[PDB]
Amino acid sequence: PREIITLQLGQCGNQIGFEFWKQLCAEHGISPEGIVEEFATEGTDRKDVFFYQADDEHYIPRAVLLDLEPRVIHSILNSPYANLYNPENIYLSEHGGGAGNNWASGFSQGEKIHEDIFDIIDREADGSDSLEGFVLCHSIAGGTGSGLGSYLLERLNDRYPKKLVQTYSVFPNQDEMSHVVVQPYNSLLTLKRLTQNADCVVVLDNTALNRIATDRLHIQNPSFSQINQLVSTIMSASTTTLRYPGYMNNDLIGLIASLIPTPRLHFLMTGYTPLTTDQSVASVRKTTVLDVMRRLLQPKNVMVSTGRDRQTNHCYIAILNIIQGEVDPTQVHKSLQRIRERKLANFIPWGPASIQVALSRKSPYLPSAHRVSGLMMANHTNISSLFERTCRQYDKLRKREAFLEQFRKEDIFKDNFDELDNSREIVQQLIDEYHA
Amino acid sequence: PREIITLQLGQCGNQIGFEFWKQLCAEHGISPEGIVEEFATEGTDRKDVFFYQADDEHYIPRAVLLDLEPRVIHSILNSPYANLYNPENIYLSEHGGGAGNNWASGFSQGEKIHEDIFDIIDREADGSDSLEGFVLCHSIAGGTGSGLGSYLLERLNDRYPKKLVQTYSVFPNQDEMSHVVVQPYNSLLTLKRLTQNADCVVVLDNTALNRIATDRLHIQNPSFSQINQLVSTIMSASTTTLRYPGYMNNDLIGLIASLIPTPRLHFLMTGYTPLTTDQSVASVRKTTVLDVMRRLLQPKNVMVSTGRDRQTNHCYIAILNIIQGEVDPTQVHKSLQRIRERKLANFIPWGPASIQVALSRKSPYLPSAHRVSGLMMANHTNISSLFERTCRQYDKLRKREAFLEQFRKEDIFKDNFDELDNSREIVQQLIDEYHA
Amino acid sequence: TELALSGLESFSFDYIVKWPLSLIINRKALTRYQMLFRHMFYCKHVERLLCNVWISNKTKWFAGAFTLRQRMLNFVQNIQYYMMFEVMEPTWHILEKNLKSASNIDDVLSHHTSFLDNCLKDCMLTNPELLKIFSKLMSVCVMFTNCLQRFESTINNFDSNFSAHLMDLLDKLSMYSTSDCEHSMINIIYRLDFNGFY
Amino acid sequence: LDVLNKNYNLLEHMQAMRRYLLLGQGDFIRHLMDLLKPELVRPATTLYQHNLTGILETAVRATNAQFDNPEILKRLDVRLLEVSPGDTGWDVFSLDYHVDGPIATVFTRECMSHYLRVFNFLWRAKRMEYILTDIWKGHMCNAKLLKGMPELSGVLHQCHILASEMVHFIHQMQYYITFEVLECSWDELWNKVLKAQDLDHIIAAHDVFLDTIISRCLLDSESRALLNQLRAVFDQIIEFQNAQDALYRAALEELQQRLQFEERKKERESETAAEEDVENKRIQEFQESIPKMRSQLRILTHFYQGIVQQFLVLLTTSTDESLRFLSFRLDFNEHY
């Protein structure tokens, strides 16, 4: 019916998808090894849209996880949520990889394991006779997720041409350049494949993570154990129309169709306010829907590093405001009434704009059926500031003679560096041209 | 909506803003790590005007704290109110700074950390699509708060031109000149930026603090632990129309608009009477509002060192008298009846004057819903006596050959000393000219 | 009553109420409420735009242009606190007598409707020519926004225009001093003799 | 109210009919309408009935594992018209809620006869949502396969913008007019039936319910200005669709012969003037078919500009009912 195959790949893409499947059992009322609660069918009306359909009421995840590093998968099998995963769909015990840290490693390893990489991931494709598409849950940081992920964006474009492609990709961190220095090279090589060899992306910045991780979360030493908490909730938040029973844009080709203006303009800004557990003691007094979307357009919950004074000459075109759970829908048109009076979104002068609001009932659970949740999927034309940030860090590195002799020994014979530079400037010029 | 970003900066500006946020939880009925009381929404009708809006009913403070000295921030994390602060909005653990004691240190450090200082403080700007403005909660004493604070008064004037700027700045102490000697230099350099690169200030004298700290408080050895008690109450007192539900001048651009006569005349005199805890046993007999504003215009609660015999040729133009909590509003027009009979405020002979009184209900708390509170925001033209005090201590120091060779080695090539002297005399001449 | 609005908008609020609560808050009483909401929103509508213009200007002929605005703003901040306060003290007095007396329902109905007639007469204060000076006050708001879009002869045209409503303010103050010594006029004298000692 | 709850659950059938004829739940009707489309593209025949009951029973099984327990699938059937077999076939299919005994006490002949009228507009609303889903996937299908030609790169680019103007304007209008009438009527009837205590007040709340909603959905004697513009956008949305794959197909097949002729260039060296003449013929057919798609686009956007202007004025004239609510909504969509 609407079966999606997630493509978890890389050192960071496997960990953000590990707790994504772990989030799904707590809201479906199911255990990874059994069914102890009856809340799975009376409370939740649809479960076989991301999981594989049941053979013994065991909803297998439709997931594949490949990585060169064996460290990310050795921290999985000792956890009690790995018995839900199957040891025959992806790998058996003692799976390995390369050495290995290179973008050209996984780019060259795709055609030497070409027979095996297109054998076991295609067995899940013909399980349903109407496949939705493929989401590449991969990474941009490092050479593991960026090297091999650029290969599958090409060969799955023609072997599966009538399928939706759209990824929840995480952006790397640009604070210092000591541990990694190959960061401007492997990022722009995948970013070219994300626009012409891929339809849509969902950007997730790393410098904007610790802006939120010290905002309300109150940590002193930033660890990697907090990167899975902001990411796994908004992943399950994006499929609330798709997993839980909704009516309009209840498919993944429903939501993405109403937000993309044009190809190579698909970078969607994400926002999510409620992350604090001591808000729970004051949501008993009928906290309404009239105050939760006034702060979405206000740049506080954003996960995109952008300029603060560059929003006057930029214009919103498509903005999504997803409320979940208890909505009190007699005032949801009242919340959309107050949008035109502030004009917090700058509107495009050539065409109409749209503020789309939708709702779906959440899990039968006490932290879910009590507190209001707001998921934002914006589309603003100030996203070229990240593309100006990455390009200015790209041409400055090529004048310092950095990784021009250390990178072209394997499988690179011609200069494909300006092939990425002009196509990035094509994106940056067509964005500003789009508001005439 | 009406979100203000506080800019806590310097050795003294960070400590006066630390208990300012600590004062706000005791009156909102909230804990810095949880919500244990239900008094936050039924008693207080508005909370998201200085805090960040909630994600889990955890009202994050919209605060940034930068200082060269790491001593002020190491006395924060062991206190149990630091978990409300976030370790990703400003800094993570082990943040440092300079060596360091110079006005030219922070003035030169602003353009070498120019990329990072305009990156994470702008993430809170786009959280709300209608930003109120910026308050620079900085210091004039020392070279830490005065050196770096003069840089942000220039670059935020054009990058954010449509925002209100107004600061609660503390004046340094002029008793002896042994420990610090650079006090006339770094003060006048920031005082030029406070008039043309800044709209309004709120003056807070240091020699007038120990006038009050030995008046009713009865201390023998003056410590720095008392400087946060007079300052944090009047900060929360100034936003009682803004935090608590009021009607008129309920914004920060409401109060400051009705008091400023002209640019470069914005120095507001502050007054606050009730600071004694043994007054509580006799406020049970209906202590009225008719006696609390007779002592505001009487020079007893003032925090400005001014001349006592210089008030006959000077005239009040704008005077604010803020009552809080229990007001008994059937006699608040009766209190304003008695103002014209005494004429304790000298009125300007060229134009009208105004005695503005306003009220707002206080916190649902027993020391707050019982005792009358009076906050004064005066504007009197005897404020040039401080400007005559600072200028006479400025030209006397330049004839003693003090810090003319020890100050111009770094980033100073021309004599900008008379650039501060004439602009200060422009303020002092236009004040006396303003009453024709 | 038989008067019209003082702007362009036909906007107002109406409260929906049914039996037996319609016996005490009447549909005729909603029309008495509908007149006071139009007056109080319009001077609040003025206070918003004027305050925004002042903040924009904040962010000599320009010192005199700030001098007319601060004089006119402090005039309109004081008068509208007076309207807010001297509505509010009949509000606490009308609250207390429903607590002091209440033993009949047609009494507390007629107690409430006689209160709205006091509020209606306080907003029928702008009947003969005051609604013309509030619109002449509004035409020099929009004439000052026509030069907000332009950034001096324009400033002395404003000094001529801001002295024009000053002489009409004393005309409205002269109209405030004329009746047979009734209480609402005595109310409007001490509030405007408050405006006299300034 | 004991008799209502002990057997033949009447209040539950009031909610169960909203998921099918009012289309309150989408995962049912979308897993229908995916499978239902390969039968509706052809004209209806005399064998049209026997397979759609099997298309029905497979699709209510693929979405349910617990809906076998109530008696709802036996009280819902399919409804076809007497229309001649020379039609498109899309307008024949409709679902109806069947009644047999005491459920037919609260449901008369006059109730489901109006439910056929509320279904046909809402089926056509979901018809426009799913055939335009096909052309949106058709935007992303042909564009990935034609990369290699520098002319046709910017040719599809402005076509995708002017198609997106019709996509976003249909979306913020069609999603909002049905969800609002869903909102005012679900919260009017379902909360009232358990606070009134009768049989005749259950139906008195019901027989005012089911004619409030259709008068806000489609049908009124004064609503002739409504459907005349909602059908003028309903045939323009077909005219915009069939002209696209009349020109996308001409854009894609002509590029397939270009790539296989490139493969013949390397094999002739391992195993020429006329070969250049056939390439110049390809470029000329590439040249002709670009203003062929342009000129049809200039005719299409002039029709859509005439539709969007006529949709405003012809919605603002009827006789003083809740049309001030309807005239509030369409100017909010085009400007914001």
Numbering used by the authors:
A (entry chain m), B (entry chain l): 2 to 437
C (entry chain Z): 605 to 663, 673 to 764, 821 to 867
D (entry chain d): 545 to 815, 821 to 885
Sentences from the paper on this structure:
The γ-tubulin ring complex (γ-TuRC) is a structural template for de novo microtubule assembly from α/β-tubulin units. The isolated vertebrate γ-TuRC assumes an asymmetric, open structure deviating from microtubule geometry, suggesting that γ-TuRC closure may underlie regulation of microtubule nucleation. Here, we isolate native γ-TuRC-capped microtubules from Xenopus laevis egg extract nucleated through the RanGTP-induced pathway for spindle assembly and determine their cryo-EM structure. In eukaryotes, the γ-tubulin ring complex (γ-TuRC) functions as the major MT nucleator, which is essential for cell viability.
The cryo-EM reconstruction of the native MT-capping γ-TuRC purified from X. laevis egg extract was at sufficient resolution for spoke-wise rigid-body docking of atomic models and thus to discern conformational rearrangements at the subunit level. Spokes 1 to 10 of the MT-capping γ-TuRC assume a conformation reminiscent of the isolated γ-TuRC. In contrast, the last four spokes display an increasing deviation, witnessed by a pronounced lateral movement of the γ-tubulin molecules around and towards the helical axis, approaching—but not reaching—MT-compatible geometry. The separation between γ-tubulin molecules in spokes 1 and 14, measured in the plane normal to the helical axis, is reduced from 4.7 nm to 2.5 nm when comparing the isolated γ-TuRC with the MT-capping γ-TuRC. Consistent with incomplete conformational closure of the γ-TuRC, spokes 11 to 14 continue to display deviations from MT-compatible geometry of up to 1.4 nm in distance to the helical axis. Thus, the γ-TuRC partially closes at the MT minus end, but it retains pronounced conformational asymmetry, deviating from MT geometry. Notably, the actin-containing lumenal bridge of the γ-TuRC is partially destabilised. While the two MZT1 modules part of the lumenal bridge are well resolved, EM density for the actin molecule is significantly underrepresented as compared to the X. laevis γ-TuRC in the open conformation. This suggests that in the partially closed conformation, actin may dissociate or have increased conformational plasticity. Similarly, further expansion of refinement to include the attached MT revealed the same protofilament organisation with both compounds. We thus combined both datasets and obtained a cryo-EM density of the MT-capping γ-TuRC at an improved resolution of 17 Å, which was used for further analysis.
